[PDB]
Amino acid sequence: SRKDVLNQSISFTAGQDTFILIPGVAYWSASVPAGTFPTSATTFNPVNYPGTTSTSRSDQVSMNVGIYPTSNLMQFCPVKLSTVQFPVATSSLVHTLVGLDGVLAVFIKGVFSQEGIQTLPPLGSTGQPFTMDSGAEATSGVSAPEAWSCPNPNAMLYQF
Amino acid sequence: NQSISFTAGQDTFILIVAYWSASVPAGTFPTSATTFNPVNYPGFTSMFGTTSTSRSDQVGIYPTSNLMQFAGSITVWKCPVKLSTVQFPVATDPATSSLVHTLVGLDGVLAVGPDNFSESFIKGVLEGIQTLPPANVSLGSTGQPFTMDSGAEATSDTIVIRVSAPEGAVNSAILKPNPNAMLYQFGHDSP
Amino acid sequence: NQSISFTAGQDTFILIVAYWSASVPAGTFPTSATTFNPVNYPGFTSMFGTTSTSRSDQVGIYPTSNLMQFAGSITVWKCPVKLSTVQFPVATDPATSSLVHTLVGLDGVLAVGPDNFSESFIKGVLEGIQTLPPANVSLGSTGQPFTMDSGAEATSDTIVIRVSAPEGAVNSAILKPNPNAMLYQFGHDSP
Amino acid sequence: KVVSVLNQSISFTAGQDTFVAYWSASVPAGTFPTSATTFNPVNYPGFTSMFGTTSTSRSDQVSSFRYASPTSNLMQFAGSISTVQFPVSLVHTLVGLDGVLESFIKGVFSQEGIQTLPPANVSLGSTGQPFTMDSGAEATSGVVRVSNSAIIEYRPNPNAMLYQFGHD
Amino acid sequence: SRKDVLNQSISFTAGQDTFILIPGVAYWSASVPAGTFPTSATTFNPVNYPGTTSTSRSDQVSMNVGIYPTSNLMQFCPVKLSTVQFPVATSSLVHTLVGLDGVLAVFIKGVFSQEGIQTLPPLGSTGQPFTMDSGAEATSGVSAPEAWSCPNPNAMLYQF
Amino acid sequence: SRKDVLNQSISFTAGQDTFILIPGVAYWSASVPAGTFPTSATTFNPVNYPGTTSTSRSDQVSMNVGIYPTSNLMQFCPVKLSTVQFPVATSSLVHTLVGLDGVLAVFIKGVFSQEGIQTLPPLGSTGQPFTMDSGAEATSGVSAPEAWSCPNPNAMLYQF
Fold this sequence. Notes:
This is part of a larger assembly, with six copies of chain A. By secondary structure, chain A is mostly loops. Chain A has one helix at about 100-105, and strands at about 15-20, 30, 85, 90-95. Helices cover about 0% and strands about 10% of the residues of chain A. In chain A, strands 1-2 form a two-stranded antiparallel sheet. In chain A, strands 3-4 form a two-stranded antiparallel ribbon. The first copy, chain A, starts with 16 loop residues before the first strand and ends in a 56-residue tail after the last helix. The relative contact order of chain A is 0.28. Chains in contact: A-B, A-D, B-C, B-D, C-D, C-E, D-E, D-F, E-F. At the A-B interface, β3 and α1 of A face loops of B. Chains B, C: This is Capsid protein alpha. Chains B, C: Belongs to the peptidase A6 family.
């Protein structure tokens, strides 16, 4: 029933090739250097549509982002969330993510088209091409040369 | 695909990923230690690589026997196989509960089903998974009746047969995405 | 046309000009040295002469085996064969680059294809060219996997079989203009 | 059963008028190509894993074929958008090709031994080509004007693993 | 787009049996003696519709000839261009021509119905019944007892 | 019958004052330095509408050029062909050209309005203010501070 909007502002990365990707989480853009692709060393910590613990957030319970020029006129994969079996030398089944390999390999007009999760890897043994994250628990769950999308009987969304 | 022959005294249990021919002596059923192997598809290891974690980085029969060996059978029931989960509490330091995989409901395999094909032979008719169960976990913890072993991953309805080769029988037959890789340029769409 | 038998231990690779039965041991695939011969058509040498340069101067199967030898297979994929060209620079005096012929894309032959017929056997189912490659040029320069040798020209989809004769098997079957010459007076026109 | 692209940002050489994905050179500004010039082409991503690598590998995965078919700012920009035979013996050569011989802003919208044309130990003068193929190194790939920064169903082989996802 | 016409005049061969055959090249008629057929020793050098090197002519890029009496009233195969493999004692693939065998074996009213090439053989080993030619490079690329037929953006034909 | 067109592209001479002048020959522009005029030392070698020897070209046998900006928005005489008598100390009559004196002496919007010859001088004694040329035989017969115009019975143009 939500209608996520986020008038986000950027000063983009001059030089660094910003690779922008994409439920509260608004968008994701690890900043990669010039010409290259996200290595295993590359990571982003997201942005979120604003408005708990990572053991609580279950208490309560669509596309077409656009990018528009914040600047003047002269300075310029179907991914699913898998998991992993891995034998231990102490057997588990924990989360990993495939499909990121379909990200590294495939102006001013701009483009419009279209519990416990905090740290996923829970690299390399996970099979993820690189490392995510969402940072601290409370605050979260294009080359330069040199989000607008979309209970229980005791929590707030029940009325609407 | 290939062309096959079976040894006397035994019956083989090939399944429909469509190559695991478990085998026990003639008349018998699989055991706990019944633990077979895969003999892979036409063209497999190129598709999902030599690297284990790279396993998701792209995303009837007829006899070959003569006639005066008149002896044999085929038998197919069927049972559904569901890959499910099972936890177990283990007194580690501190004590843990490990959730692991299991195929369940298979036990129609180990016995006669009501539905069948059974007359003579000569007419003819996720990431990380290696074995079920994997290492360090007992088959007896699962309660699924047997393990099936992938082994070398550098090499690596559910319908099972029962072809019974009695003693002194020649039992022989003809048995059988991410944008990154090139397969989009091979990919045709859904109609 | 004729009626044939095959030796144990081997599998033959007959092709569809429709007579070149390459043969390797049982289970194996052709080699570089796999180099077969033609066994010609009904009535050939009269048509295109005994003279080499005069080669353009006019312009299923069923078994023959019994039953208690119950053993065998047929296997047919298919792959297209395209006669193409290949050059190569050779340090002659002065150094030359010789363009020569090659059949390319054949390499589906050397492996399992997805599409097939494979169950038991007993049911049944330009000017100058001599060999590919010709003389004085290496097969390794071409990269086509094998040579096929015409030999004596005074005697002289592309579909290949795989009939596998295992050890101790009786594997047997029934296998198969210019105005100058008289054939205009034989020639009927296109409809 | 048949089997079923480049995003690349590039700036062109200043003072140098510029002609798998593309194979075209740059001349001096206002000038034309001659016998001295070849071009090192570019590729599609990752195709070599699908194609082949060697000095014998064209035709190991796919047999044959038929062919269906501005990074700068407004302050620094400038500029504008077979076979021949011979005595010493047969060499391939593209024939009739010679006829190749407002301003940059508005952009453009439009639709083995074989490593050199003319080949190794072979001259250009017999061939009538103005321009030389080089194809880069064969170890990576192979083959069978703008004057300031800017940007097919095949007959397969059945052994090839691409063919387990082909269609008619 | 060409419309080759050639008002050709002949004084024919009295005695010698003239065997007249047939892209600029207008017609071809090796003159053979009385009664016989073209031997391997027989050759013609063509005529051409008028209006370079044999390494240049690529710079730029339909039937019914008739024969009409030039004289008074009392004095009187689907061929295709093949090539040849031949092993060398030094391996090549060079041009030859078959179908000429369909030429040697099958008045005044007259008859109307219907790079590097200079020397082809590049005889006998070629399999040609006889020897062509076109003569010098620049000037070219019926028994007596005793042609009217039918680019690149830098050469002249581009406008029409 | 020809309709010469030539989509010519330039990067012009920054600094050097390009003086652009004007049958296959498309245009002519000797590049002269800043402020000055073509001296005797100044020369151009032409461009030509594309598509022989200089003793052959007789084998076969209208205005309004326009100039249009190839570039962005911030980085920026009735002549007749005479001849010459000259006494020799060895008497001839060879070619020279007058009217070039009416060339040395008289933005972005752009302007639209309106055998044996290879080296002519065959300077100074010729009376030409400066030296032409057409360069090699086969390939041919506005200040920066710091062509679209318009036989014999044996050559190709005879049909059209």
